[PDB]
Amino acid sequence: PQDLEFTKLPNGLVIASLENYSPVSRIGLFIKAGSRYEDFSNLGTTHLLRLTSSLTTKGASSFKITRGIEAVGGKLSVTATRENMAYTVECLRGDVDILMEFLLNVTTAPEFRRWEVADLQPQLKIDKAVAFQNPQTHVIENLHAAAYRNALANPLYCPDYRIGKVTSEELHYFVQNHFTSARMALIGLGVSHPVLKQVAEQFLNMRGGLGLSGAKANYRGGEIREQNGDSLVHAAFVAESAVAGSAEANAFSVLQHVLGAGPHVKRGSNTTSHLHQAVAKATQQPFDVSAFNASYSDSGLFGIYTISQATAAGDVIKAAYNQVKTIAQGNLSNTDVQAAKNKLKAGYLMSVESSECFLEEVGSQALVAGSYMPPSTVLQQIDSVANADIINAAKKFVSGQKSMAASGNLGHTPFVDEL
Amino acid sequence: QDLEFTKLPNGLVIASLENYSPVSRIGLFIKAGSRYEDFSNLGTTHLLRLTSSLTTKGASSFKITRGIEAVGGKLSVTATRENMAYTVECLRGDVDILMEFLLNVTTAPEFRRWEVADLQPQLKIDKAVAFQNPQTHVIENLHAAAYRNALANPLYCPDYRIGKVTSEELHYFVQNHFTSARMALIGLGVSHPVLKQVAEQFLNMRGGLGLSGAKANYRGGEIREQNGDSLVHAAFVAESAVAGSAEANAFSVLQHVLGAGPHVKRGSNTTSHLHQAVAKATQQPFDVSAFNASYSDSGLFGIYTISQATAAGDVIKAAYNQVKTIAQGNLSNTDVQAAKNKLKAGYLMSVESSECFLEEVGSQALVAGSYMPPSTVLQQIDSVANADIINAAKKFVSGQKSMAASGNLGHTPFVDEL
Amino acid sequence: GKWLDGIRKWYYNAAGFNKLGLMRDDTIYEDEDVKEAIRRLPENLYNDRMFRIKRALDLNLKHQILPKEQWTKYEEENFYLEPYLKEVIRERKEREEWAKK
């Protein structure tokens, strides 16, 4: 009706429904499988696995799946982060059942016929290329490769050498060892609870709970420098932060919103953002500075991401770095802290507004926690963060070992040694 | 007879020998190299050594190629990170034509833009064939991960610079680095008076110095190349002493103690401590050597290992331990003498071939200006003592490491772990 | 059963493709479904089929026959192309059935 109900089935499948009364029903299966669960042997498997949503299954054919999904008018999509993988299917209210069946066949019995896998292999390169069109994704992938030495270092996109050599046996092994009931969660927004129970009864018989879950994501203060011909260099230097779901993680988030994460006025450099003001007096050419912040189950990463002209590159980063140092020194007023807390609360609510992002958030927190955290609790938690905690987070970032990844001309970008 | 490093008034160091071999060999060694280029013109030298046969101001490309072929001689260009040599080999009575060709190629090249554009695709093929052996690729990544300013510049143009090397950059590099004081003319078969004459032909060469810069600052960085190769090649290094120093001799003797290369066909390298250690470390086929490079500004002594991925770490660890044992002082006198014999024999046997002798003389002329006879080299090698070798091992063990690896990389330790 | 098996064995021996070292699936006409079924064959089976067909062509060019010992045996024949061809035909019929609705 108005509140969702997290329910853990005896199999281990956390099932939750909301009944939003929207004309479009939306059901997502969030598996705890991700790129971090790959190893050196099967590197890049999850990319193809995400690209094999429409392949033929044991219970339904590829043609049948595609044509049925189109004719119903719904859509099945796969969204993969470094830890979780979501199969989200959106349809009309009276068209759930059919598509739901498809979902089951895509996740429980996905027979990877090798010829279909080979035919899909070339699309890996195209998807990687189109994703890398945005420089931020490329630099962030290099940063993860240069910051961790284990799980989180595994790239989201298939490596170039693995593009044509992902055998279907690897896909089957990954699905069997990771797509299991205790590592999955079914979340339905439009669907009423009993219908979700009925559809999850199909998932009640699956692989055994708690599949392979290894690696600890050990930190590594490494670097990855690209040396491209681009006039504009984009770099990111980051230090270890708190794990996801911790008070210190909230402190780091409030710190990033103090520094500045995105524009709030179109066509206008953020007057309140300390980083933008600091870099503006450092370099006059067009730039863009943000406080990158990622939180994971085992670790976290907080740092500065800057896009600026190569000839001034170093200056920019130094300026940005210096700004954080000042907050580490203790120079942190209360007005900008309250402004950043307002920004964070508003951003969280705005993200939760859209039904897709609400479903993603509910699925993620169901996978990690298993108990729903209402937005009021999130607001209370962020309000709990104090100035001393923010200064401690900034001090930890300044003191900790740093990993940097840059892309561009790289003729003036300092190394992490002299950062 | 003996060489005499006569220096011309402009600065061109001219040396001549009188080996009565029927092939006369001439070599123009310029102090230009990949280290002398920067981020703006990265990869220029790689194309520069491929433009030897392009048309010049005084001779055409067709004329150069056909004349060199018809004479029967060969014009080749060798390049390292510091020096660039134009070596021309001909018959005794066919020196003037090829010497004029050399003059035109070096002093007054005319980089026609269409010719440069047509030559640029050859860069990809040359880089690919040169990267066929893993050693060169790993050493290039090692230089990129060890230095940060000068020696980090690759010998082969980066992929992004393959199709964008304008002829203006080539002209700028030539006229800022191919200058008289940074060059040396060496003639083996050529008698000294004609060598003086061709040097006089070279007399009006650019200016009297170049845009020498940078200092090759050292970074303890690492480059990891995740590949599907079953075999993994790793190379972890520490900054040794500059070239032409007693400590450089100590590091070379240390590398020959560790084992630089095989000495018996299909041999097990019984003397090589590294091979013996890795043999008990891992049973699958391996290959361990003590990489050692010396330069004017800095140096790099380290361990290069080709092993199986699943054993990679183990292998390098064993190798590392060996040097550590020598650092502790467990260095007897017999193996020291064996390594000194190996070094002296290797140097003298390398000097045998006229090409390598010419290269050695050119390098010495560029960096010293006075020829160092092999007897003095042997004396300097013998001067190295056990304590100096222990000090070199201690410097390697205590110094900041820079490592480059390629392969499966599922078990290779990082720089901090190594 | 037994009578039908005897007639089938007689027909297999009468049809001369076993004399040339061929199997039954090598003889099937190469239409679009068979082309895709061949494309779906594993590399080892594809190479074996290619060599058997080439050897049969070479024998036919020589107007010779493989020795009686080397003839394919009806009781020891593999229908390797049957599953792939049946799957391709099933997919095509599914597409047609959808396209007629």
Side-chain angles (χ1 to χ4, degrees), chain A, chain B residues 1-73 75-417, chain C:
Chain A
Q2 310 301 137
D3 306 64
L4 51 87
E5 301 84 359
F6 279 15
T7 302
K8 294 197 177 187
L9 291 183
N11 195 8
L13 187 68
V14 190
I15 166 191
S17 87
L18 176 76
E19 187 46 62
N20 188 88
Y21 300 101
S22 65
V24 153
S25 63
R26 196 159 313 177
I27 13 179
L29 186 68
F30 299 78
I31 310 101
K32 203 180 292 303
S35 66
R36 69 172 296 178
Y37 293 88
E38 306 177 353
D39 63 325
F40 56 92
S41 64
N42 61 15
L43 207 60
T45 294
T46 47
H47 193 21
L48 182 60
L49 187 60
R50 152 183 41 170
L51 285 200
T52 52
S53 59
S54 62
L55 283 197
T56 186
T57 64
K58 184 182 305 177
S61 183
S62 172
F63 176 88
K64 171 179 176 55
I65 283 182
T66 304
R67 303 309 170 175
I69 290 178
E70 290 186 13
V72 156
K75 57 184 179 302
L76 171 64
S77 55
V78 189
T79 310
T81 172
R82 295 186 173 274
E83 295 184 325
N84 300 6
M85 180 178 302
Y87 293 81
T88 299
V89 48
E90 317 183 0
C91 54
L92 311 188
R93 280 205 158 274
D95 299 353
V96 179
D97 319 1
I98 299 99
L99 271 62
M100 197 44 185
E101 167 68 16
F102 289 153
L103 191 68
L104 174 75
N105 290 357
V106 178
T107 183
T108 59
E111 49 169 2
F112 299 109
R113 302 185 183 178
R114 43 179 183 82
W115 50 85
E116 296 182 351
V117 173
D119 297 357
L120 264 187
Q121 293 293 357
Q123 195 177 347
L124 292 180
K125 186 185 304 299
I126 283 86
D127 192 8
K128 185 182 180 65
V130 300
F132 281 176
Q133 292 180 348
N134 186 12
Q136 187 165 5
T137 66
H138 181 46
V139 152
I140 286 178
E141 250 58 39
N142 285 123
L143 167 70
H144 284 282
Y148 294 96
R149 59 158 62 101
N150 193 12
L152 297 173
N154 293 9
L156 282 180
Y157 307 100
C158 183
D160 295 356
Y161 81 103
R162 281 302 302 266
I163 271 181
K165 305 181 311 186
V166 185
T167 64
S168 65
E169 302 177 356
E170 299 178 6
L171 294 175
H172 274 287
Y173 188 82
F174 192 94
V175 170
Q176 290 168 13
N177 297 275
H178 300 272
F179 284 13
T180 164
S181 56
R183 299 173 74 263
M184 290 161 51
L186 186 56
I187 316 291
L189 296 186
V191 182
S192 68
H193 222 306
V195 182
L196 252 214
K197 304 172 189 297
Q198 174 61 27
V199 301
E201 184 71 15
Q202 302 172 357
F203 299 90
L204 197 71
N205 37 88
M206 283 191 309
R207 276 66 57 97
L210 284 90
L212 290 182
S213 63
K216 198 203 169 304
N218 303 19
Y219 186 77
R220 156 186 172 250
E223 307 179 44
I224 287 183
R225 293 183 47 149
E226 298 182 33
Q227 184 59 71
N228 284 7
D230 307 356
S231 301
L232 283 74
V233 45
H234 28 278
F237 66 97
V238 176
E240 182 87 337
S241 67
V243 308
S246 182
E248 191 183 10
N250 297 123
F252 274 104
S253 300
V254 181
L255 178 68
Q256 91 163 329
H257 283 283
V258 168
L259 273 50
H264 299 190
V265 166
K266 180 188 174 295
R267 205 76 67 164
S269 179
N270 300 264
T271 56
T272 182
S273 176
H274 299 285
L275 261 39
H276 285 272
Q277 301 311 303
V279 176
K281 46 187 172 61
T283 66
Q284 308 186 24
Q285 301 288 326
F287 61 91
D288 183 14
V289 183
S290 62
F292 173 83
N293 178 28
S295 57
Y296 300 109
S297 299
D298 282 352
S299 168
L301 285 183
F302 173 81
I304 283 78
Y305 180 85
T306 53
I307 323 110
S308 65
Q309 315 293 334
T311 60
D315 300 353
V316 167
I317 1 193
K318 293 179 182 177
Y321 190 43
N322 287 21
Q323 196 65 26
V324 198
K325 303 174 70 62
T326 60
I327 297 191
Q329 305 295 152
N331 175 83
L332 178 62
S333 54
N334 196 93
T335 60
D336 43 351
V337 162
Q338 186 65 21
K341 299 168 81 63
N342 274 320
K343 296 175 190 166
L344 203 165
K345 295 162 66 174
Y348 180 84
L349 296 183
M350 295 337 287
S351 63
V352 171
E353 263 198 355
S354 56
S355 188
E356 175 212 27
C357 304
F358 174 83
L359 180 69
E360 290 186 350
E361 162 76 1
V362 172
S364 298
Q365 63 192 324
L367 276 193
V368 294
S371 184
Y372 179 63
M373 179 167 302
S376 62
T377 300
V378 175
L379 268 48
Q380 292 180 4
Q381 287 182 12
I382 183 207
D383 286 8
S384 177
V385 174
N387 307 131
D389 197 2
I390 305 169
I391 294 183
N392 288 134
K395 190 182 308 303
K396 177 173 183 176
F397 162 75
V398 170
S399 306
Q401 184 178 10
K402 302 191 173 61
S403 313
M404 189 193 59
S407 180
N409 182 264
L410 299 197
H412 308 75
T413 68
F415 299 82
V416 103
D417 304 6
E418 67 256 8
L419 185 58
Chain B
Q1 303 183 200
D2 284 359
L3 307 91
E4 46 280 297
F5 285 15
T6 300
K7 290 198 177 187
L8 282 192
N10 54 20
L12 185 62
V13 188
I14 62 178
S16 181
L17 201 50
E18 195 41 45
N19 281 18
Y20 295 103
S21 62
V23 159
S24 64
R25 204 152 314 185
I26 310 177
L28 187 65
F29 298 79
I30 309 102
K31 203 180 291 303
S34 66
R35 82 190 299 268
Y36 289 89
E37 79 196 20
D38 61 329
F39 56 91
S40 60
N41 58 6
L42 204 60
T44 294
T45 55
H46 183 20
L47 178 62
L48 188 59
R49 74 196 183 201
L50 292 194
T51 57
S52 56
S53 62
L54 285 195
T55 183
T56 62
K57 187 179 304 177
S60 183
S61 173
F62 176 88
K63 170 179 176 55
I64 283 183
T65 305
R66 303 312 171 181
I68 290 176
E69 290 187 10
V71 160
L75 172 62
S76 57
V77 195
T78 313
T80 169
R81 300 185 178 274
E82 295 194 321
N83 300 337
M84 181 176 301
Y86 290 81
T87 299
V88 59
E89 312 180 355
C90 55
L91 306 186
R92 280 205 163 275
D94 302 328
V95 176
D96 315 4
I97 301 101
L98 281 69
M99 205 51 192
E100 170 68 17
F101 285 158
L102 191 67
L103 256 103
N104 288 357
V105 169
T106 179
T107 68
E110 185 183 1
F111 301 108
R112 312 267 183 85
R113 41 185 175 84
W114 52 86
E115 295 183 350
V116 175
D118 299 357
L119 262 188
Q120 278 180 9
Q122 178 74 9
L123 295 170
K124 326 177 185 181
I125 298 183
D126 193 8
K127 185 183 180 65
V129 301
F131 280 174
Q132 188 171 359
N133 42 5
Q135 176 100 5
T136 62
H137 186 11
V138 178
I139 293 314
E140 211 87 344
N141 281 12
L142 179 62
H143 283 276
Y147 296 94
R148 57 173 64 170
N149 182 17
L151 298 172
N153 293 10
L155 283 180
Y156 311 98
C157 61
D159 299 356
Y160 83 102
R161 278 304 300 265
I162 279 181
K164 308 195 310 299
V165 184
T166 64
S167 65
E168 302 176 357
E169 299 177 5
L170 292 176
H171 273 287
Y172 188 83
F173 191 93
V174 167
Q175 73 193 17
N176 292 280
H177 301 267
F178 286 13
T179 178
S180 57
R182 294 171 76 263
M183 298 165 72
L185 184 58
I186 320 294
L188 295 190
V190 168
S191 72
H192 219 301
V194 271
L195 206 279
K196 296 181 182 301
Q197 172 66 19
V198 304
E200 177 69 16
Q201 294 189 10
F202 278 109
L203 187 64
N204 40 80
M205 260 200 310
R206 223 79 58 183
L209 253 189
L211 289 188
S212 61
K215 201 205 165 303
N217 300 17
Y218 180 88
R219 60 183 284 255
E222 59 177 352
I223 285 184
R224 243 175 174 76
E225 189 182 20
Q226 179 69 26
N227 283 9
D229 310 357
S230 302
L231 279 74
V232 47
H233 327 273
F236 60 100
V237 81
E239 188 178 22
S240 61
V242 310
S245 181
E247 193 178 5
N249 296 123
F251 274 104
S252 58
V253 180
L254 179 65
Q255 93 164 323
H256 282 278
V257 169
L258 273 51
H263 299 272
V264 169
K265 184 61 162 55
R266 316 171 192 277
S268 57
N269 295 273
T270 57
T271 183
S272 179
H273 301 279
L274 265 42
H275 280 273
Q276 299 312 300
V278 179
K280 48 181 175 60
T282 63
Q283 317 295 339
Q284 301 288 145
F286 60 90
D287 186 12
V288 183
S289 59
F291 176 83
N292 174 86
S294 58
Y295 301 107
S296 299
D297 281 352
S298 167
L300 289 182
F301 173 80
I303 305 184
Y304 187 95
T305 57
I306 300 178
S307 65
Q308 306 290 336
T310 61
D314 300 355
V315 165
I316 85 165
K317 183 180 179 300
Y320 195 47
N321 288 21
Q322 282 306 310
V323 199
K324 304 173 70 61
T325 58
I326 298 193
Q328 311 295 152
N330 306 19
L331 180 63
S332 56
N333 196 93
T334 60
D335 43 354
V336 160
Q337 189 66 20
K340 298 168 84 61
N341 290 6
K342 293 173 199 160
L343 212 177
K344 296 161 63 176
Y347 178 85
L348 295 185
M349 295 167 332
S350 66
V351 172
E352 292 176 347
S353 59
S354 298
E355 177 212 23
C356 304
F357 176 82
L358 183 68
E359 291 185 354
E360 166 78 358
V361 173
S363 300
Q364 291 188 9
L366 285 189
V367 306
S370 181
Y371 183 57
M372 184 173 176
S375 62
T376 309
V377 176
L378 269 49
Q379 291 180 8
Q380 285 200 0
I381 293 173
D382 290 5
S383 178
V384 173
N386 297 15
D388 198 2
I389 308 173
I390 304 305
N391 293 330
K394 288 182 177 300
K395 181 170 185 176
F396 166 76
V397 168
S398 305
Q400 185 177 191
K401 264 75 174 191
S402 305
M403 185 191 55
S406 297
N408 189 29
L409 303 183
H411 308 77
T412 67
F414 298 78
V415 278
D416 46 359
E417 276 112 26
Chain C
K2 310 176 60 58
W3 178 65
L4 225 184
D5 269 66
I7 308 177
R8 285 195 170 111
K9 181 177 180 179
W10 167 87
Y11 184 87
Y12 184 95
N13 292 123
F17 60 86
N18 73 325
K19 293 181 175 60
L20 281 69
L22 291 170
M23 293 183 174
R24 184 178 59 81
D25 286 338
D26 308 354
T27 313
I28 197 164
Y29 171 56
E30 180 97 347
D31 69 328
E32 291 78 353
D33 301 3
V34 164
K35 290 176 78 64
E36 182 154 348
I38 295 305
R39 190 189 68 90
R40 296 178 176 188
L41 280 178
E43 184 169 342
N44 58 92
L45 290 190
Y46 180 88
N47 292 332
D48 294 359
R49 176 184 190 268
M50 220 62 194
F51 168 66
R52 263 180 280 104
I53 293 175
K54 183 183 181 62
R55 200 231 288 101
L57 297 177
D58 181 66
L59 289 177
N60 188 28
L61 135 76
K62 300 177 181 181
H63 300 290
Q64 295 186 5
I65 288 184
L66 217 56
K68 189 180 182 62
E69 162 72 7
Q70 303 190 40
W71 293 359
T72 313
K73 307 179 65 178
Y74 165 79
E75 311 169 357
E76 200 185 343
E77 190 174 39
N78 288 16
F79 300 155
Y80 61 96
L81 197 57
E82 272 193 10
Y84 301 92
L85 184 62
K86 286 183 63 178
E87 184 68 19
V88 173
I89 293 180
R90 179 200 320 274
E91 294 178 358
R92 185 197 61 187
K93 284 188 176 181
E94 174 188 359
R95 295 185 311 177
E96 293 177 354
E97 181 66 30
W98 178 90
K100 74 204 296 181
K101 293 179 186 302

